[PDB]
Design an enzyme around this catalytic site. Structure first.
Site, short mmCIF file in Angstrom:
data_model
loop_
_atom_site.label_atom_id
_atom_site.label_comp_id
_atom_site.label_asym_id
_atom_site.label_seq_id
_atom_site.Cartn_x
_atom_site.Cartn_y
_atom_site.Cartn_z
N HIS A 41 0.85 -1.22 0.00
CA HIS A 41 0.00 0.00 0.00
C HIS A 41 0.88 1.25 0.00
CE1 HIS A 41 0.61 -0.36 4.39
NE2 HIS A 41 0.34 0.95 4.42
N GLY A 143 4.55 6.75 9.26
CA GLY A 143 5.89 6.40 8.75
C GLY A 143 6.44 5.10 9.34
N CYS A 145 5.27 2.22 9.13
CA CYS A 145 4.89 1.09 8.25
C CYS A 145 6.13 0.49 7.59
CB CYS A 145 3.87 1.52 7.21
SG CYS A 145 2.19 1.49 7.88
#
Ligand SMILES: *[C@@](O)(C(=O)NCc1ccccc1)[C@H](C[C@H]1CCNC1=O)NC(=O)[C@H](CC1CC1)n1cccc(NC(=O)OC(C)(C)C)c1=O
Ligand SMILES: *[C@@](O)(C(=O)NCc1ccccc1)[C@H](C[C@H]1CCNC1=O)NC(=O)[C@H](CC1CC1)n1cccc(NC(=O)OC(C)(C)C)c1=O
Lengths: 302, 302
Positions: A41, A143, A145
């Site tokens: 994503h 951030g 992720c």
């Protein structure tokens, strides 16, 4: 002496973190040999996030507009094989720091260390557990992720977790490194049930076996119970059933300690209905259940 | 989202750990540039430990019988300058991994990460604090000695702690890197007072400012108090006095959060006399005081 929540040294992973940008979203990747792993994503442009089309982006999107950075060393992209919810970019350069490493799926109750990163740089390390509902109680912001969870098996890094999202109750969901979610979660902005979480019965026991070791032994009682009766005590107190495997694993402790698993079981159930009266076990006024039998042993033998 | 006890990434320190042997005792050293730092009592032969003579050993002992190992790479010894309770060995080779680094003395209340090592290899990292009595609640076994505590200031490693000994209550004492003990402790086997430990008032506040942030806000109350009155509440509850500096540091939080320090002060004192009723703040049934105002902020802005 003493007993602490303790994460694996982060050095071996630190050397694998890189930044991955695509338009409006920059997040973390894992650089292993000549491939780099990130949440798919990274290609979503918000909007998409309401209900995306990761088929009708992956191939439709082009290498060049994927900005991979290894500090400054702007890695030269190649491949774009998509595995489930991970996007795997093969790159011209292979990692000289690549540790002896391995991709593994952990069961509920198991723990790992998390190395929480932003812009490809680490900010800190903490240990948490796969909750029964397949969530983790972690500490993540915008951030974070692509941050990864791991165990170390001598010189071998077992990677179990990549971070994707936050759930209703300020808890976290993410995938394994072959890109399949822990729990029934999807990378999309829908109303997703966290799930009702049990307490990890065995881990709470292993914790008390760590207590007695470190001198704190007050909780201990004058009774015993059965594996059956106990379980039906567990049930009103949202404790996972206890199983023969769970017993056979609490042996190596119950052994050294003397105390037999079924006494600790009564010693435990006493605490469950009675309260804690405001006294504390190993500097905690709550029953801790994010320590595996294994976790204890390594922190009592390097 | 979420809030965890979180240590600095250990990578930058991992590259500085080495083993140091002398007869019957092997323990850890810190390899910085072309010198290696270890607890001086690496030269004690038990016996000595009852009341040693680190003058009448240091010079009387010879380089060669100091076995320094950087994994296998048996570092070539040179110097033996003794600073207080540390023994500093200059070595033929300088560290290529030597991080931008610094030797610093921390005050009580401040936290650091600990990288706990055996035979020069790390086993894990945890965050703890310099307790008011100048002890730390850590997790150390035989061989942990020379393990170091540290902060990281961007790319800069501030070294604050080297581990020496355990105290009565399963708590730990050690020195700074210029070899001077935190607290009134000596490297010798005598009856040493741990000391009566206060709770770090400011840290407990900063923790509640972290709660409200992460949605947990129930504890909050309908009152206020004075900096004076509060303090005399602190005193029966073994809370360190609260000071104008302590207030001025809880600002940057109390700011963003809205809530003014003196309300949280009442919100706190309510909890102190009342009990916690068995409810929990950020997944803890106890008031946590090993989080500096600073600690919170970095874990809410990478
Ligand atoms: C990741 O960090 C991420 O995907 N975003 C990176 C980023 C964000 C901003 C600026 C630069 C880079 C986050 C995890 C973050 C978000 C806030 N706290 C965290 O732990 N993941 C998401 O944003 C995630 C993406 C999903 C497709 C997989 N996500 C999107 C939308 C909504 C939520 N969750 C949310 O707010 O819902 C709850 C359930 C009410 C919390 C979400 O997690
Ligand atoms: C260090 O690890 C150390 O100096 N020894 C390294 C070693 C030990 C065995 C085999 C190979 C290498 C330890 C810290 C350890 C000891 C057990 N748990 C730990 O955290 N420090 C000491 O042993 C220390 C040495 C002092 C001169 C500085 N020390 C010696 C004797 C007695 C104690 N403490 C003790 O048992 O007393 C209390 C107060 C009752 C706990 C001690 O710490």
């Amino acid at each position: 002496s003493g007993f602490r929540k303790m994460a694996f040294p982060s050095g071996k992973v630190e050397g694998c973190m890189v930044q991955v940008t695509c338009g409006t979203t920059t997040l973390n990747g894992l650089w292993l040999d000549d491939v780099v792993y990130c949440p798919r994503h990274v290609i979503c442009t918000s909007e998409d996030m309401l209900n995306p089309n990761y088929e009708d982006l992956l191939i439709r999107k082009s290498n060049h507009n994927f900005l991979v950075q290894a500090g400054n060393v702007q890695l030269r992209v190649i491949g774009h094989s998509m595995q489930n919810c991970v996007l795997k970019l093969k790159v011209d350069t292979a990692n000289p720091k690549t540790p002896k490493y391995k991709f593994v799926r952990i069961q509920p109750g198991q723990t790992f260390s998390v190395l929480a990163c932003y812009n490809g740089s680490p900010s800190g390390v903490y240990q948490c557990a796969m909750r029964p509902n397949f969530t983790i109680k972690g500490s993540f912001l915008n951030g974070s992720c692509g941050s990864v969870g791991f165990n170390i098996d001598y010189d071998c890094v077992s990677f179990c977790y990549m971070h994707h999202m936050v759930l209703p109750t300020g808890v976290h969901a993410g995938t394994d490194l072959e890109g399949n979610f822990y729990g029934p979660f999807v990378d999309r902005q829908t109303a997703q049930a966290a799930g009702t979480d049990t307490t990890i019965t065995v881990n709470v026991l292993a914790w008390l076996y760590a207590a007695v070791i470190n001198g704190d032994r007050w909780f201990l009682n004058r009774f015993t119970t059965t594996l059956n009766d106990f379980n039906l005590v567990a049930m009103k107190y949202n404790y996972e059933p206890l199983t023969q495997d769970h017993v056979d694993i609490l042996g190596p402790l119950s052994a050294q300690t003397g105390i037999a698993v079924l006494d600790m079981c009564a010693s435990l159930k006493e605490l469950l209905q009675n309260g804690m009266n405001g006294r504390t076990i190993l500097g905690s006024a709550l029953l801790e259940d994010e320590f595996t039998p294994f976790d204890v042993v390594r922190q009592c033998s390097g």
